[PDB]
Amino acid sequence: RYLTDMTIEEMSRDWFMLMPKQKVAGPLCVRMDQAIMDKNIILKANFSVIFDRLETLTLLRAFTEEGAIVGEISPLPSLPGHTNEDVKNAIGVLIGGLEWNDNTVRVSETLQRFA
Amino acid sequence: RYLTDMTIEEMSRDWFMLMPKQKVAGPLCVRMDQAIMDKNIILKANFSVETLTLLRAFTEEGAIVGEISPLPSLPGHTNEDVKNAIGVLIGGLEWNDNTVRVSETLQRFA
Amino acid sequence: KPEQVEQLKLIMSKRYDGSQQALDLKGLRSDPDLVAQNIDVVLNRRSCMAATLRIIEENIPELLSLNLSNNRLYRLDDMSSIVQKAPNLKILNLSGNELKSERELDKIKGLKLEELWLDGNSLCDTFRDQSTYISAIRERFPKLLRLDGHELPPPIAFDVEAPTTLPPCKGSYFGTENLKSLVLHFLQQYYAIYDSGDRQGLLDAYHDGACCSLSIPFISSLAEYFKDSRNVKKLKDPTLRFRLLKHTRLNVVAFLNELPKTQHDVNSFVVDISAQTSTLLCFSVNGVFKEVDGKSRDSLRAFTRTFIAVPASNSGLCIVNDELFVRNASSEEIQRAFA
Amino acid sequence: KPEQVEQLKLIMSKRYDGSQQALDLKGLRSDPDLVAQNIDVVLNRRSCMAATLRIIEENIPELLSLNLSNNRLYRLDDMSSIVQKAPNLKILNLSGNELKSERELDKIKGLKLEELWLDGNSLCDTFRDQSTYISAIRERFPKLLRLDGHELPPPIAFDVEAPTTLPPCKGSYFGTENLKSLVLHFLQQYYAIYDSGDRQGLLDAYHDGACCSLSIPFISSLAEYFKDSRNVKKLKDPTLRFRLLKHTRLNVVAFLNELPKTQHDVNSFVVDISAQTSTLLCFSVNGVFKEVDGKSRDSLRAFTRTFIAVPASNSGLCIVNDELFVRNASSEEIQRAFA
Amino acid sequence: SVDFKTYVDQACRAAEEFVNVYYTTMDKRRRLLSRLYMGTATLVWNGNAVSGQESLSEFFEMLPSSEFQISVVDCQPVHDEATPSQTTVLVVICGSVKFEGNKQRDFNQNFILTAQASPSNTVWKIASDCFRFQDWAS
Amino acid sequence: SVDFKTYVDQACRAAEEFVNVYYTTMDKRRRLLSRLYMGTATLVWNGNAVSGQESLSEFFEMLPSSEFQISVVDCQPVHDEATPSQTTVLVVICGSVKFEGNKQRDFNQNFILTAQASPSNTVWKIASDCFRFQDWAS
Amino acid sequence: DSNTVSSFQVDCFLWHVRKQVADQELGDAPFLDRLRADQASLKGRGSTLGLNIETATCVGKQIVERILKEE
Amino acid sequence: SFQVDCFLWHVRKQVADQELGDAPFLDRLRADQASLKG
Secondary structure, three states: OEOOOOOHHHHOOOOOOOOEEEEEOOOEEEEEEOOOOOOOEEEEEEEEEEOOEEEEEEEEEEEOOOOOOOOEEEEOOOOOOOOHHHHHHHHHHHHHHHHHOOOOEEEOOOHHHOO | OOOOOOOHHHHOOOOOOOOEEEEEOOOEEEEEEOOOOOOOEEEEEEOOOOOOOEEEEEOOOOOEEEEEEEOOOOOOOOHHHHHHHHHHHHHHHHHOOOOEEEOOOHHHOO | OHHHHHHHHHHHHHOEEOOOOEEEOOOOOOOOOOOHHHOOOOOOOHHHHHHHHHHHHHHOOOOOEOEOOOOOOOOOOOOHHHOOOOOOOOEEEOOOOOOOOHHHHHHOOOOOOOEEEOOOOHHHHHOOOHHHHHHHHHOOOOOOOEEOOEEOOOOOOOOOOOOOOOOOOOOOEOOOHHHHHHHHHHHHHHHHHHOOOOHHHHHHOEEEEEEEEEEOOOOOOOHHHHOOOOOOOOOOOHHHHHHOOEOOHHHHHHHHHOOOOOOEOHHHOEEEEEEEOOOOEEEEEEEEEEOOOOOOOOOEEEEEEEEEEEEEOOOEEEEEEEEEEEEEOOHHHHHOOOO | OHHHHHHHHHHHHHOEEOOOOEEEOOOOOOHHHOOOOOOOOOOOOHHHHHHHHHHHHHHOOOOOEEEOOOOOOOOOOOOHHHOOOOOOOOEEEOOOOOOOOHHHHHHOOOOOOOEEEOOOOHHHHHOOOHHHHHHHHHHHOOOOOEEOOEEOOOOOOOOOOOOOOOOOOOOOEOOOHHHHHHHHHHHHHHHHHHOOOOHHHHHHOEEEEEEEEEEOOOOOOOHHHHHHEOOOOOOOOHHHHHHOOEOOHHHHHHHHHOOOOEEEEEEEEEEEEEEEOOOOEEEEEEEEEEEOOOOOOOOEEEEEEEEEEEEEOOOEEEEEEEEEEEEEOOHHHHHOOOO | OOOOHHHHHHHHHHHHHHHHHHHHHHHHOHHHHHHHEEEEEEEEEOOEEEEOHHHHHHHHHHOOOEEEEEEEEEEEEOOOOOOOOOEEEEEEEEEEEEEOOOOOEEEEEEEEEEEEOOOOOOEEEEEEEEEEEOOOOO | OOOOHHHHHHHHHHHHHHHHHHHHHHHHOHHHHHHHEEEEEEEEEOOEEEEOHHHHHHHHHHOOOEEEEEEEEEEEEOOOOOOOOOOEEEEEEEEEEEEOOEEEEEEEEEEEEEEEOOOOOOEEEEEEEEEEEOOOOO | OHHHHHHHHHHHHHHHHHHHHHHOOOOOHHHHHHHHHHHHHHHHHHHHHOOOHHHHHHHHHHHHHHHHOOO | OOHHHHHHHHHHHHHHOOOOOOHHHHHHHHHHHHHHHO
């Protein structure tokens, strides 16, 4: 059974790269901007769950309070599978990469139940 | 509006008296046990705030230690004699070197 | 000769020491009083010995010390009659004689003596060492203290201190006069109902789940209790063990009314309160009761009942476990029937 | 087919309890989760069960409770390999299944079970009573706490409180540093004279009337000591007892010169001061020595010597009694030669 | 959530082990009997009362040697109301004993035994003991 | 006024009696052993020291049960100067012992024994005792 | 600020429970009144706020449980 | 009928005691109590 933190209108928005940084840490493509300084960042995401642990991912995105997209996580077509521990690795990656630029980062209440 | 600090399951249990002591401090039957030494004594009680119902004290294993109960065979239960009897009981227990924990409900009303 | 005998009392007092209650006879024959008057007194033949016995039995039968050193005493067949005349004697000297056997000592071994001298007698060569000699004398006299002027060491003596005193058998124990009043009142009420014949009133004293059981000794005159005796040491079947137990107040009080009607001597009850906590009180009751029905309506029973009681409101106590042991009364238990 | 497993994961997640980590498979045929799919899941075939095991083996092998009730489980010959896959599993329910024989139970006795359900299975009818059944369950799992929802009382356990620990073996005891320096000093002097070769210098350390005696154990390398080995357990003759005892300082040191000349390891001496009074001091010394003369100068000996000494003017001590126990040294005594 | 006939069968299966332990241990290992009583245990021996592990060990050191042959035993599981969440059993014993240099006498005795739970091993200890001679007064 | 050959033969005829009492009594009646030591007695057991009747009883409660087979014994009367006007004998005993659940070991031991005098009866008591294993270090 | 967003999300979760009641066709008269009034007010609220009903009607499910876990 | 009022009012009140939600939402809760009284 699935979750919805993002509207399909907001699920489709593409975005630009200020200080583009992309990394593959597991079966995940993580996309980040470094030019953003000291601004509130909210993590919203839609995915599926199994035994209270994320089965699969659809999309993870970061907004400001004004509504600007910062970071993305996407599975790979070259690597489809992704067990929850790989997801946890991506989670830690995001927490670090965002608290580096001292950008305040909000976490929606769905995600922390699973990592 | 009323209080509930003790379960009616544990509130209905009767007890024996090792060292029985009974006192009349007004319209009050005050009953104490002196035999309990160096054991934690927890003070829990349910009441309204005007009239009296019942006072009980427990150990760690769940044994009832002290009581105060009014009588209909004696006149109406004014609060101040009871308030003095409370200190009387706590004192009688600190005589026996029992470490005494007091719940926070009681000081609000007496 | 009696004229010769007459002088002997004189010579005996001559050698009688009143300061030490001692009599000295060291070498009596070579004492020139015997050379005088032409009378010699030999200490081997019985005539002289019996004359001395008569003398002492009349004069001083409470003497404590005696010296008979160097007197050619071959055998003591004739001195065995000294024990009854002077039993107060404590010190004896028999040195330098011709006592052939130490078995001769068995001829006077009824005394209670303190000091002995046996040196000079040839018999000492008949023992391998000194311990054989001392133990062979111990066979006849352990009462001695010094031998041959030597103070003898006290013998081997190990007191393990094995305790055999049993504590005093006291009577009823309750502890507090309050528990005394409590359990006594309960006994009175309960056993008042129990002797009425319609015991159904015990249902208010027992718990919904109060257990009860009966027991008796192993061998009749006590047949009517036999069918329900429960003895797990002798009874192996577990399911029968369960059905031979009585569980609910209904079943308990019913079975209790099934027992022959009684009269207990409660004034002669003996109560032992084993444990009292806030949640239970166990005590055993030892007493008697008489039956009034059946063929053995004149036979008297003694009982040991055990009660466990959880508290009941208004100072009462509700029995949770009950064990009745029933035996026939002892003879004196019958004698002390009722007061 | 593996997609069958993929769809199995869904209903396994629907029946997973996250507060208690429990999985229920109770009567899978009823309550139409199976009926809403037209798939029957038989827990008797090895493929289906192994696939179900694999799902959790990938997802949650830390499960706490498992329910396999009412699933036509005839035999578990292939599920005995479950213990290693989910070892945190503590509660197991096998009720209403077809577990025919207890012979299966010995194949899974490696779990850590706390609650088990085995009622409804016919094998439980194979015991006359409940004690044989419960002891047969203890035969496989004593770790259990509740069975078939019934709280089992902890088993019979009487710890006699039998003590078998031996205290720590400490070394030399002196008590006061004064007695330490004293008795070590005296041991040094005596054993220095003793190894000089002319032991006659011991005359001033012994008493005019100081006794001495020697002993060795019973079984050789200790032949030269036989002439003076003294054991009252083996020797009954009293005159021989006296003659094997050494009495005067003269006779003592004469006999002491009879033994083969020695060299003791005193840095490895072990001193025990048994009693100190105002009039005496007894102490035993445990040590080793090597002979240096005769045939056994390559043989090494161990000894336990006992000294009793009265104080003597000018702070000295006079030996009154001396008992020497001599044995050949153990192997480890040899190894720990000198410090 | 607890069976009863099982309570009875544990009581029986327990009493014979306890008897075979307690009386053989008083006859054979008297120094060791005292540790069978729990710390707050009480004993009435012919009316005289003992309270405490220490004074119990004292009393058993002072007691003469014994030779018990037990006649009859009965047991009863004790209701969870007397001791909540405590498995407890009552035992009564009729028997005889010959003491050190004392005439052999008949006696009744009854124990109450609770099992206390320890994560190492749950163990059984006596909480009350009552002993009396059948001819105690004489 | 005192013989010596008798003193030695009494020491011998006494030491075997004491042995047959003390070791049998430690094997059979441990509760009672401490009462052989006089109130001022001292004992050194493998370096640890015991002084006092009561603490002697405590220590003997603490010791495991035993199985003694005695190898050799020697005795010596002790000169009147060590204990004035006291008949005293030294006894040394080498033997073996098997403990409860402990490995069997050989040992040497030595006691000193004085007789106490009472106008009723003189008795024998230990004044010093030293016990040590032959393999005590291992 | 966050109070407004959280309160709107819980309001829409309550209304989603109401519309699930309407998914079982229990036309609760006072409750259907509350339902259509909430619809007419909350569609306009969400249009003024800039967060769709599809966000709140699924965010409220955890906002409610945060308080229940704290007993 | 009446119950969903009871449960939703319980939920809103325990959102409020955690000091969460707008002031208008507390005002409307007060109105809810005043209406549930009648």
